[PDB]
């Protein structure tokens, strides 16, 4: 097991303690680059496919890839398959160390910039509608860039299938199968450990998204996949209990209604609202159980909702902070 040392450490450390008595910030450090399944990936090209929007695409050259999304998944999967050196641009969400010097093709957060994309002379764009504008995606295709729209399932159960889908696009089915199986083994193993750590009465959680000290401050719902993360950590997602399907402003009324025990956040996002002290100034935060315990689990932004290959490790690291 790639997470074997971590699992052994967790099993040796005590969890008789009541996690409802823990206070303060817990921050999970960056997990780093995905370990590739091969050092000699040899894409079997060309590939013909029909993408998630119904577009027929031929992928004939994967030398210059733009793997773009909101969550940071595709760039990590591409590296896991053996093609990290082929990535020529990224969004702000693909924060993994291997891409730190790679050109960023989004502006103002997540807005696709056509000029930045086309100036990189990509041979393949892998993207989904988690980012836009849609019109920019259309412009890139119209400029002659092979563009493949994905629609990943983004559940823990589908980590392997989402990997296999990416692998098919780039003509690496064997690497896809290896990476899928490794990643699913790691998540199931993590879950066995999480189940041993969790309290009988699960912790109530919400995923709080922040960008700055103003109104970009949301409870994330079904569409963003945080339920999958929260339940993977042994929690109950209060957004799911309330039926939030997209996102909702994290105003005083919503926070009082949801009343989580833990806020799950992204670490750079938390910094952007002034850290835990800045968070505690926001209306309604301090009045929740989580606020009263200053209880925040901050996860590396570009891994937090990426799922993919490193999900198991994320769950183990995060659960250690919740329960040990
Ligand atoms: C759910 C997954 C998401 C992830 C992983 C993510 C990640 C990030 C990251 C890593 C940054 C970079 C901060 C920086 O510029 O230094 C950022 C910025 C930003 N995000 Fe997101 N984001 C997500 C969702 C959203 C959503 C739903 C919105 C708005 C509805 C949003 C709006 C912004 C804005 C406005 C910025 C710019 C902040 C700045 O100038 O620094 N993001 N995001």
Numbering used by the authors: 32 to 355
Give the published text.
HmuTUV forms an ABC-type heme transporter system, in which HmuT, HmuU, and HmuV are the heme binding lipoprotein, permease, and ATPase, respectively. As CgHmuT is a substrate (heme) binding protein that shuttles heme to the cognate ABC-type heme transporter CgHmuUV in Corynebacteria, the regulation of heme binding and release is very important for its physiological function.
While two different orientations of heme were observed in Y240A-CgHmuT, heme was accommodated with a single orientation in H140A- and R242A-CgHmuT. These results indicate that there is equilibrium between the high-spin and low-spin species in the R242A-CgHmuT solution, as is the case of the wild type. While the heme bound to wild-type CgHmuT is not reduced by dithionite under normal conditions, the heme in H141A-, Y240A-, and R242A-CgHmuT are reduced by dithionite.
